[PDB]
Design a protein around this ligand. Structure first.
Ligand SMILES: *[C@]1(C(=O)O)O[C@@H]([C@H](O)[C@H](O)CO)[C@H](NC(C)=O)[C@@H](O)[C@H]1F
Ligand SMILES: [Ca+2]
Ligand SMILES: [Ca+2]
Length: 448
C-alpha cells in the first residue's frame, strides 16, 4: 500500500564474511544510544550444531539505523571445536552496560551429551571450576591458579578464555581435545559486556556456578534478546530467557535474572514447575519424563503492570505462553496454547512495542507460520485485559490483529527490534546456514 516500507533484504552475514563459511542464530538489539547491534554464530565448518563444528561469536554494529553496518568482529573464539553457540543481547539502562550471553561447550560436547551439573565445586565456601587430568583426578581453579585434590598449588594457571599456562607459558586450553587438564564436558553460560555501546567487549564470565543446578544437564541461552523490567517492584531487573534439560534429557524453559546490574544472576522456576497440564496432571521440570510437555527456547515480554509473558517453543504445534506475577521467579500453573499461531518447533522472537496501536499496548512477533520452517510471518499482537485470575491479578490476552508474510520459502530463527524511527528491524534465517537477512518494515506495511 501507499507509504508501506519493507526494505529489500540485505545479507548482514553470509559465507565469506569474517572468513566464516556459515552463519546461524540471529540476535538484534537497539541500544540506548540508538545503535543496532547484531550478533550471530560464525559457524566455521558447516552449519551443524555443536559438537560437530567450531563456532565463534560475531557482532556487527550500525550507527545510522541499520542503513549501513561496520566490518564486524569476532568477540569469542575457543580452539579446537570448542564452540560458543546461541547469543542473546540486553542492556542495563541505568549503567549503559550492554550484555551478550551465549552457551559454551568444551570440544566434543553439545546439547545432547552435556554432562550433569555446573562444572564447579564448593571448597571452603566458594565455587571453583573443576579440571580433570588423564587419570580423572580432580583439580580446582582458585583465582586462576590450579590446585590439586589435596589443595596444593600446581604449576598451572588459567585465564577467562580457558588458556592453560604452565609456569606462565601457554601450553593448551582447558576446552580443547588435547589439554592435560580439561573442564567438565557440559554446557556453560558465558557473559560478556560492553561499556562503549558495543565497540569493545569484555572477556567471558562463566556464570554457571550462579545459575546451573546439579540436576541440569544442558542449560543454555535461548537466543535473541532479554528485557529489563519497566514497571512495578521488579523495575530494573534484567531478564534473560534460557532453557535446560533434566537428568532424563527433557527440556524446560526458564529465565535467569539479575537485580544488581548483571553482577549476580539467579535462575527462576520453569513454567514446567508445578505446571497443571490440560486435564489436571501436575509435573515439574526436575522429574519431567515425557516429550509432550517440553518447553524449550523462549522469549519474554512485559505487560503494562509488570507481569511477564514467556513465549515458548514447544511440541504442541502452536505457540505456548506462560505468565509470571513475580518478575520471572515462578509462573502460573497454566501454560496457554494459542491456536492462532502455528509453532513448527523453532525459535521465535517477540518484543514489546513502544507506541500504542489502535489504542492498545502491543507486541511484535516473528516466527515461521507453518508446520515447517517456512512462511516467515510478522504479527502485531494487541494486549487486552480480560478480567482477572482467581488470585486477583490481571489476566492479559493477545489479539493477533495484524499478520504479514515477510519471507516466502525458508524461514527459521529470527530476531526483532524496534528502531529509533518506530519501524521494526528483523534479522532472520532465510537460508539454513548461509545468508542471514536484515529488513526494515513500517507499521503501514505490517498492517496492510
Ligand atoms: C536450534 C535449531 O533447532 O535449529 O536448536 C538448538 C537446540 O539444538 C535445540 O533447541 C535442542 O532441542 C540449537 N542450540 C544448541 C545449543 O544445540 C540452536 O543453535 C539451533 F540449532
Ligand atoms: Ca573457534
Ligand atoms: Ca508453577
Amino acid at each position: 500500500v501507499e507509504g508501506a516500507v519493507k526494505t529489500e533484504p540485505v545479507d548482514l552475514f553470509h559465507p565469506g564474511f569474517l572468513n566464516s563459511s556459515n552463519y546461524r542464530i540471529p540476535a538484534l538489539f537497539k541500544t540506548k544510544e540508538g545503535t543496532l547491534i547484531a550478533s550471530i554464530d560464525a559457524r566455521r565448518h558447516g552449519g551443524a550444531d555443536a559438537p560437530n563444528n567450531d563456532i565463534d561469536t560475531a557482532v556487527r554494529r550500525s550507527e545510522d539505523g541499520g542503513k549501513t553496518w561496520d566490518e564486524g568482529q569476532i568477540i569469542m573464539d575457543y580452539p579446537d571445536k570448542s564452540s560458543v553457540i546461541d547469543t542473546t543481547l540486553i542492556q542495563d539502562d541505568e549503567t549503559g552496560r550492554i550484555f551478550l550471553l551465549v552457551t559454551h561447550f568444551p570440544s566434543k560436547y553439545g546439547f545432547w551429551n552435556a554432562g550433569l551439573g555446573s562444572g564447579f565445586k564448593n571448597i571452603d565456601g566458594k565455587e571453583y571450576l573443576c579440571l580433570y587430568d588423564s587419570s580423572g583426578k580432580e583439580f580446582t581453579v582458585r583465582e586462576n591458579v590450579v590446585y590439586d585434590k589435596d589443595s596444593n598449588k600446581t604449576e598451572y594457571t588459567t585465564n577467562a578464555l580457558g588458556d592453560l599456562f604452565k609456569n606462565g607459558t601457554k601450553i593448551d586450553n582447558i576446552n580443547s581435545s588435547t589439554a592435560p587438564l580439561k573442564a567438565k564436558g557440559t554446557s556453560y553460560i558465558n557473559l560478556v559486556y560492553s561499556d562503549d555501546d558495543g565497540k569493545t567487549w569484555s572477556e567471558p564470565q562463566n556464570i554457571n556456578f550462579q545459575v546451573k543446578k546439579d540436576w541440569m544437564k544442558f542449560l543454555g541461552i535461548a537466543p535473541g534478546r532479554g528485557i529489563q523490567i519497566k514497571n512495578g517492584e521488579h523495575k530494573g531487573r534484567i531478564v534473560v530467557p534460557v532453557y535446560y534439560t533434566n537428568e532424563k534429557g527433557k527440556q524446560s524453559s526458564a529465565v535467569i535474572y539479575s537485580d544488581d546490574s548483571g553482577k549476580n544472576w539467579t535462575i527462576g522456576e520453569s513454567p514446567n514447575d508445578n505446571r497443571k497440564l490440560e486435564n489436571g496432571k501436575i509435573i515439574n521440570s526436575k522429574t519431567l519424563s515425557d516429550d509432550a510437555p517440553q518447553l524449550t527456547e523462549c522469549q519474554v515480554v512485559e505487560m503494562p503492570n509488570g507481569q511477564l509473558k514467556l513465549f515458548m517453543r514447544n511440541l504442541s504445534g502452536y505457540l505456548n505462553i506462560a505468565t509470571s506475577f513475580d518478575g520471572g521467579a515462578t509462573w502460573d500453573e497454566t501454560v496457554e496454547k494459542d491456536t492462532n499461531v502455528l509453532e513448527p518447533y523453532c525459535q521465535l522472537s517477540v518484543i514489546n512495542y513502544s507506541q500504542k496501536v489502535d489504542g492498545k499496548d502491543a507486541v511484535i512477533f516473528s516466527n515461521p507460520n507453518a508446520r515447517s520452517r517456512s512462511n516467515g510471518t510478522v504479527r502485531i499482537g494487541l494486549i487486552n485485559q480480560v478480567g482477572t485470575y482467581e488470585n486477583g491479578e490481571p489476566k492479559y490476552e493477545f489479539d493477533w490483529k495484524y499478520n504479514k508474510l515477510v519471507k516466502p520459502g525458508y524461514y527459521a530463527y529470527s530476531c526483532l527490534t524496534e528502531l529509533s524511527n518506530g519501524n521494526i528491524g528483523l534479522l532472520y534465517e532465510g537460508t539454513p546456514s548461509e545468508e542471514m537477512s536484515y529488513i526494515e518494515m513500517n507499521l503501514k506495511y505490517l498492517e496492510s
